[PDB]
Amino acid sequence: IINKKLDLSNVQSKCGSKDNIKHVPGGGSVQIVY
Amino acid sequence: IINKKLDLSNVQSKCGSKDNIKHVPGGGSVQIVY
Amino acid sequence: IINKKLDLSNVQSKCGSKDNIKHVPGGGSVQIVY
Amino acid sequence: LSNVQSKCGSKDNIKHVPGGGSVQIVYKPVDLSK
Amino acid sequence: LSNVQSKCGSKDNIKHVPGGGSVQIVYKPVDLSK
Amino acid sequence: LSNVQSKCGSKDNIKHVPGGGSVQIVYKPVDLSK
CA distances A5 to C4, F3, F15, F21, Å, are 10, 17, 47, 65
Q: Do F2 and E2 touch (CB under 8 A)?
A: yes
Strands D26-27 and F15-16 come out as unpaired
Chain E interface includes A31 (CB < 8 A): no
Alpha-carbon distance of B7 to F5, in angstroms, equals 14
> Most F CBs within 10 Å: which of C23, C29, C32, as the mutation test of the F interface?
C23
Cβ within 8 Å, pair F22-B28:
yes
In this complex, is the C-beta atom of E21 within 8 Å of any C-beta atom belonging to chain C? Answer: yes
d(CA D2, CA C15): 26
Query: Looking at CA atoms only, how far is residue C25 from chain B in angstroms?
Result: 5
| Residue A15, phi then psi, degrees to nearest 5 | -150, 150
Question: What residue of B is the nearest CA neighbor of F5?
Answer: B10
In a 10 Å sphere around its CB, with 0-12 CB exposed, 13-18 middle and 19+ buried, how is residue C33 labelled?
Answer: exposed
- In the structure, do chain E and chain C come into contact, i.e. share 3 or more CB pairs under 8 Å? yes
DSSP per residue, C1-34: --EEEEEEEEE--S-S---EE-------EEEEE-
What is the four-CA torsion angle of E9, E10, E14, E18, rounded to 10 degrees? 30
The chain E residue lying nearest D16, using CA atoms, is E16
Look at residue F3 and give its three-state secondary structure: coil
Name the residue among A10, A19, A27 with its Cβ closest to that of E21.
A27
CB contact under 8 A, A16 and D8: yes
| F3: nearest Cα among E2, A12, C6 | E2
A29: CB partners within 8 A, 6+ apart = B27, B29, B30, B31, D21, D23, E21, E23
- What residues of E are in contact with residue F11 (Cβ under 8 Å)? 10-12, 14
Task: For residue E23, give the DSSP letter.
Answer: B
CA–CA distance, E20 with C23 (Å, rounded to integer): 11
Please give the helix or strand (H or E) that residue B6 lies within, else none. Answer: strand B3-11
Q: Write out chain E residues lying below 8 Å of D34, CB-based.
A: 33-34
Resolution of the model in angstroms: 3.2
Are the CB atoms for E11 and D10 separated by under 8 Å? yes
Asked if A26 contacts B28 with a C-beta cutoff of 8 angstroms, the reply is no
Regarding beta strands D11-12 and E11-12, do their DSSP bridges make them parallel or antiparallel, or are they unpaired?
parallel
Edge-to-edge strand list for the sheet holding E11-12: D11-12, E11-12, F11-12
Give the whole-angstrom CA distance, residue B20 versus residue D20.
21
